């Protein structure tokens, strides 16, 4: 009956936690605040995301890269199985996306 989508993000110390659906219709608020949301961070937690489309994964890669440009290596924690299937389809190397 109800199929609403949202995307939220909370930074706790050095870890950024995304939760909700990470897809095309809701990712704009995060991209506009991309540089402010990831630059205190050294680990992105997709632990609490339920859906990831191709555009949302592209946003994730840019978020990972923005933290790499700061100079601190970043961890990927809690990634869903389907996201890795999508990454394997796009042959995403270890640079853009840690496994």
């Amino acid at each position: 009956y109800f199929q609403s989508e949202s995307l939220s993000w909370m930074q706790t110390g050095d870890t950024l936690a995304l939760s909700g659906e990470l897809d095309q219709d809701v990712l704009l608020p995060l991209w506009e605040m991309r540089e402010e949301a990831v630059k205190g961070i050294t680990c992105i937690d997709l632990s609490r995301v339920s859906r990831v489309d191709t555009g949302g994964l592209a946003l994730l890669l840019h978020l990972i890269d923005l933290a790499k440009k700061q100079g601190n290596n970043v961890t990927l924690q809690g990634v869903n199985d389907k996201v890795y299937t999508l990454a394997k389809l796009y042959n995403l190397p270890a640079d853009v996306l840690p496994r």
Partner: protein
Amino acid sequence: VANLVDMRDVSFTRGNRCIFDNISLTVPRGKITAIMGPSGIGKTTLLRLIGGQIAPDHGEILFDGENIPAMSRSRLYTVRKRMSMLFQSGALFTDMNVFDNVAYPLREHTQLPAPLLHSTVMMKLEAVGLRGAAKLMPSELSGGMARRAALARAIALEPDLIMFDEPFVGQDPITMGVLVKLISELNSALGVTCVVVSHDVPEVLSIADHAWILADKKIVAHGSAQALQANPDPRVRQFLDGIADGPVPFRYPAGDYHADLLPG
């Protein structure tokens, strides 16, 4: 819904001859469905019925629960945007390169930001292995390489249903093997629903989750690949195995041979 397309007692007639005698067919969403049958049965016709370009005489064709023939012209126009009939004409703009082709749909019909759109096309070009051909033109593209770029642009907007009309014809086993793995890869990753019409029976059954065989204006037999290739039925076995003689006779009915050789 469990079935993205659901045909219910569908009959279609052209001129004096009947093509379909209330057929009822199912395409479960997220899975690969294969349509097979002799040339001239109405496979292309059956696809255009799902698309709405032609309407049945009787029956109903429910896409995502919604009956296509009864749709408004405003509604059918919008519902068709969730579909993609591949290897048609149009396919690729001939005046822009490969990257601009696959990017063109998102550049207009989505309000995704620009740097993410750019990364999205790069990924989808890697999906069909044409990231190095991003600056090439369709003029320079190979035979199979062109059709892979069409597939890339088709999944650019990520439609719900993709239909392939004999996509393997005139292709060497390397070109064909690439397109078979590609279709199976995009189905198991993006979850796109695929309908594949083909005569290459062994290749299509290797990736299909459900198959259908048509003959004599009706559905001869359906089922899974393992269920079909173990089905012991002469008219099903003759088609799946490609045997010269069976319920489809090799010999046209002729009458007495001795008289035709030695008359008067």
